[PDB]
Amino acid sequence: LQITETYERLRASHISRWGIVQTTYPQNIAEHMWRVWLLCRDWGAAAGMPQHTVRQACEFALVHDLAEIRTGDAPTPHKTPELKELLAGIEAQIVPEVAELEATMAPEARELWKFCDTAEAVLFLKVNGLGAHAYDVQHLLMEQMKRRLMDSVLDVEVQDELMFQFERTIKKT
Amino acid sequence: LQITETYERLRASHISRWGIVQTTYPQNIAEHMWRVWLLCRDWGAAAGMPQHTVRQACEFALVHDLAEIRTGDAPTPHKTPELKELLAGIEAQIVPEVAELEATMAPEARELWKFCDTAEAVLFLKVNGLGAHAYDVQHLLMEQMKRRLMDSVLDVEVQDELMFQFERTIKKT
Amino acid sequence: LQITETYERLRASHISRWGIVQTTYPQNIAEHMWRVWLLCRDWGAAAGMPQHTVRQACEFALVHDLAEIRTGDAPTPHKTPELKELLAGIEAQIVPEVAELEATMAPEARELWKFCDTAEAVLFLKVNGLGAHAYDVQHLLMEQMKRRLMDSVLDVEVQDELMFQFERTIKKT
Amino acid sequence: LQITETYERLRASHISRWGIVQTTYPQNIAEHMWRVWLLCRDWGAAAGMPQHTVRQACEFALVHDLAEIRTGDAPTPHKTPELKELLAGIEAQIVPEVAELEATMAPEARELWKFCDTAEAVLFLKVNGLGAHAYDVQHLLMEQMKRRLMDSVLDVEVQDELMFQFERTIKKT
Amino acid sequence: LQITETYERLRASHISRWGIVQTTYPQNIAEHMWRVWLLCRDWGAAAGMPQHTVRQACEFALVHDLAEIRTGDAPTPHKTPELKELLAGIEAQIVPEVAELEATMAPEARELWKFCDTAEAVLFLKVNGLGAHAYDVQHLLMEQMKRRLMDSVLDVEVQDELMFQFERTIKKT
Amino acid sequence: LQITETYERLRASHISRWGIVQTTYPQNIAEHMWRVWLLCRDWGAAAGMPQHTVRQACEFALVHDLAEIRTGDAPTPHKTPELKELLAGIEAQIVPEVAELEATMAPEARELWKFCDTAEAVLFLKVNGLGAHAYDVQHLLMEQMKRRLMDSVLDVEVQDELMFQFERTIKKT
Ligand SMILES: Nc1ncnc2c1ncn2[C@H]1C[C@H](O)[C@@H](CO)O1
Ligand SMILES: Nc1ncnc2c1ncn2[C@H]1C[C@H](O)[C@@H](CO)O1
Ligand SMILES: Nc1ncnc2c1ncn2[C@H]1C[C@H](O)[C@@H](CO)O1
Ligand SMILES: Nc1ncnc2c1ncn2[C@H]1C[C@H](O)[C@@H](CO)O1
Ligand SMILES: Nc1ncnc2c1ncn2[C@H]1C[C@H](O)[C@@H](CO)O1
Ligand SMILES: Nc1ncnc2c1ncn2[C@H]1C[C@H](O)[C@@H](CO)O1
Ligand SMILES: [Co+2]
Ligand SMILES: [Co+2]
Ligand SMILES: [Co+2]
Ligand SMILES: [Co+2]
Ligand SMILES: [Co+2]
Ligand SMILES: [Co+2]
Ligand SMILES: [Co+2]
Ligand SMILES: [Co+2]
Ligand SMILES: [Co+2]
Ligand SMILES: [Co+2]
Ligand SMILES: [Co+2]
Ligand SMILES: [Co+2]
Ligand SMILES: [Co+2]
Ligand SMILES: [Co+2]
Ligand SMILES: [Co+2]
Ligand SMILES: [Co+2]
Ligand SMILES: [Co+2]
Ligand SMILES: [Co+2]
DSSP: OOOOOHHHHGGGGGOBSOTTSOBSSOOBHHHHHHHHHHHHHHHHHHTTOOHHHHHHHHHHHHHTTTTHHHHOOOOGGGOOHHHHHHHHHHHHHHOHHHHHHHHHOOHHHHHHHHHHHHHHHHHHHHHHBOSHHHHHHHHHHHHHHHHHHHTSSSOHHHHHHHHHHHHHHHHTO | OOOOOHHHHGGGGGOBSOTTSOBSSOOBHHHHHHHHHHHHHHHHHHTTOOHHHHHHHHHHHHHTTTTHHHHOOOOGGGOOHHHHHHHHHHHHHHOHHHHHHHHHOOHHHHHHHHHHHHHHHHHHHHHHBOSHHHHHHHHHHHHHHHHHHHTSSSOHHHHHHHHHHHHHHHHTO | OOOOOHHHHGGGGGOBSOTTSOBSSOOBHHHHHHHHHHHHHHHHHHTTOOHHHHHHHHHHHHHTTTTHHHHOOOOGGGOOHHHHHHHHHHHHHHOHHHHHHHHHOOHHHHHHHHHHHHHHHHHHHHHHBOSHHHHHHHHHHHHHHHHHHHTSSSOHHHHHHHHHHHHHHHHTO | OOOOOHHHHGGGGGOBSOTTSOBSSOOBHHHHHHHHHHHHHHHHHHTTOOHHHHHHHHHHHHHTTTTHHHHOOOOGGGOOHHHHHHHHHHHHHHOHHHHHHHHHOOHHHHHHHHHHHHHHHHHHHHHHBOSHHHHHHHHHHHHHHHHHHHTSSSOHHHHHHHHHHHHHHHHTO | OOOOOHHHHGGGGGOBSOTTSOBSSOOBHHHHHHHHHHHHHHHHHHTTOOHHHHHHHHHHHHHTTTTHHHHOOOOGGGOOHHHHHHHHHHHHHHOHHHHHHHHHOOHHHHHHHHHHHHHHHHHHHHHHBOSHHHHHHHHHHHHHHHHHHHTSSSOHHHHHHHHHHHHHHHHTO | OOOOOHHHHGGGGGOBSOTTSOBSSOOBHHHHHHHHHHHHHHHHHHTTOOHHHHHHHHHHHHHTTTTHHHHOOOOGGGOOHHHHHHHHHHHHHHOHHHHHHHHHOOHHHHHHHHHHHHHHHHHHHHHHBOSHHHHHHHHHHHHHHHHHHHTSSSOHHHHHHHHHHHHHHHHTO
């Protein structure tokens, strides 16, 4: 069950996202993690977040979905509380080092990472989603991203900077 | 959670299979279910199985993976006993009519269906799998298909006919 | 010429549709037949059509385009009366069992099947068609679907139910 | 029916080949015609064929499959003598200018063109064909290409040069 | 460095265009050159250009991007004056025969070819471009195509015919 | 010319690699950079390289090909000494921050990064390359990777560990 080899970790590029949504091509978790890392780096710096917080979010962004090399990438609505608790233990066996980073992550770094994880999905579907259901998922994810940020421990000024950067970015995507 | 609309059921063609395996293109559950239905029809008749048993397996084959319109298509190794029990209840809420057909299916029809469900995957990867991991998965699925058939309630003569047809088919695929 | 083997019938997933229309990906006849079957099942029941009529349309839907494993999937405008008469005889040699089902099909089951065969194409292009010509073909097929239904032997109440379901479905596709 | 506009002729790149054969991607008739033209140019010159003969074959190669913008690209085995006679008249209405070039083509230019038309298909499948059926079609086309060349009006020395170039080319493709 | 073999020239279909722009699929230089040739042929004749000028533009269109079999297809904005001078010498070593045709091309044939080379790209992106950046590139290329034509040695009447045909074509693409 | 915006950096996933080589799909520079980063992290640690050296190679791996968002991804054989000198200055204007990291990189970190940059390409083509030319490029890149490592400043023990890990990885890819 545990992922221990580089040949297995390289299969991040063989893991297809958007399993229940029509898209122009099958996006993999490697390109997703690189783009989430990029957003953490750029938007964490734009929001004036502490260097240690941005570094922690970037480090997590690069490996955060590695358990999907075994589990597959399940659609967010499927992950109900009872399923997520079972998945938490399974993912801890698959990628113990990722579980350790997750357990150490400061709340501010977690909120920067989660904002970027969701923003990357909205930005991806803006270009590559096909059809009414994909349109609805893109808009639902944007609504969820905003609500989570608004209710987060991030300072209002930081939330505003993140939304300022997100809106500017999606307009040119 | 429950699937109630034709526009949702049509999304069987938007559900991508092989979420953790490299393939030439993203196969969807609609083409998979049609091919499993075809194998149940042809191989059930070739094995001289009772018409009622073949009909039951074909009817189940056409809708068996419909819950994946909500859950996504998780890789078989991920479905451990504890996860499968949680998934059974969730899938019963998603597609109650499919759960009812599954609960009514006779053991012989279930074994014909399962043999065809797995054979379709091996046949698909024979043409469309890419790389060492896909090669291993194709061979593991074939080994699992054979072991399940060998330990099933199907008569030895029926198991032999099914293996006779499977081997002839894969050689020309 | 005759299709006699399961390895040949499995090639329904190797037969590409939309040979002269730009699309996001090459849809195959297996996913098409599964979706047409689904529409016959759901919309035949929604329209309150007799169970025997719905069953006949569903049975035909699952195999109706199998001759295309040999002929290829020719674009509808190409099939003029003189060509269709030649193709009828060729297809009868390729898939005699499909020709027998076609010859037995009741007019009401044929009209439910044809409405669903065309509706599936319009629904597919709504999501996956690319460009002006694909847009025109999607709209021409919808116009043809409506005209055929309006001039059919189906009761006005059944035609209205089918159009009610079609419009609701395409709006969410 | 007649193709009269540049926007229609540009749809050569929207016409998918290999309608009944599994391939890595959908090759269009525009890339096919360019490659057939290239083979006529290079191999006609390598075989020392008269400049007028090579020019005629190249000119035909560039437009030879244009009627498929309306008809679709039917698989060669489907084109039986009776169907080909009906298709000849239909294609003459679709592309009268292509029909005129075909009617004027000298036997030697026709044989250079046909050798290149078939060789391009074998070369394409060598790289992009997937599965047993595609393998068989690639080998059947090569056998047909050789038999037609061997029975043609081309001088033995020209046939040998064409086969010499074909074998060298496929080895490095 | 020099391209000398037919197996290398056949790789025109392995050279992907739009290296920095999101598209529905990877268009190759073979389909591009065929479409540019088609536009030169049709639009050169529609504009009443001399037969020798149209022939020269068509001949160049068919081979003009062959050096990209070695260089790759670099995005137009990247080709600054200093880089283009270095590339001119490299391309002359790669495809000496293409360099000779380019050096012989009359200004009017060059302007017909360049108008068609750019128009083909705008027409391609109209159907197959994805996202804001692809939209901007499509519109920038159209602006560049118009400005170059307006400042060219072509007679105003010829420029008007070319724009008349371009606008009619894109409206139906 | 300079890349200054996150919406531009996100286009790493719109930059297609392998511009002159046939592949199963168009790999982008984002998935490439993530995989190169992964190889630097895992193989740098496996080789017992100093933590500061591994960190420097990983940091460079994540952004090393960002200038290709403007330049496109040119094939390695095209980058001759004279072209590389011109490209060095252009890339310094496009991504000044990447140029600064490159200028600061220690020789050992550069050799770990370059080994991983090339190994990722060989591993990618092992699964996704199509045809004779792609096969030759995969083998040429492996030969180049080995020769550069053998002539590098890395200790023989480190070179042996890197080759030990590379061979184990490719066997299971
Ligand atoms: N509402 C949704 N419906 C369907 N798919 C969705 C939805 N939200 C996220 N996703 C996808 C994106 C990733 O593949 C995965 C989350 O990591 O789930
Ligand atoms: N051993 C395996 N590794 C990875 N993927 C596998 C394996 N076996 C089956 N699959 C896929 C096929 C379907 O998408 C899905 C089962 O419905 O899981
Ligand atoms: N007007 C049309 N133009 C082009 N293609 C069309 C048109 N109508 C249907 N099709 C396609 C759909 C199937 O592939 C096939 C019919 O089974 O033809
Ligand atoms: N034996 C064959 N089986 C299936 N497809 C074949 C066969 N030979 C040629 N083709 C394809 C290639 C073109 O798409 C088209 C001929 O222009 O038919
Ligand atoms: N402004 C642009 N930005 C990005 N890509 C562009 C642009 N203009 C042309 N192209 C592409 C088209 C061909 O692949 C190639 C020119 O032969 O460059
Ligand atoms: N010998 C070669 N022939 C063709 N393409 C090659 C070769 N070596 C590398 N590549 C590709 C890989 C990247 O896209 C790019 C280098 O970053 O060039
Ligand atoms: Co996920
Ligand atoms: Co994620
Ligand atoms: Co601010
Ligand atoms: Co499944
Ligand atoms: Co299944
Ligand atoms: Co028997
Ligand atoms: Co059809
Ligand atoms: Co049909
Ligand atoms: Co009603
Ligand atoms: Co054809
Ligand atoms: Co042809
Ligand atoms: Co000779
Ligand atoms: Co170019
Ligand atoms: Co060009
Ligand atoms: Co005029
Ligand atoms: Co590069
Ligand atoms: Co690189
Ligand atoms: Co060691």
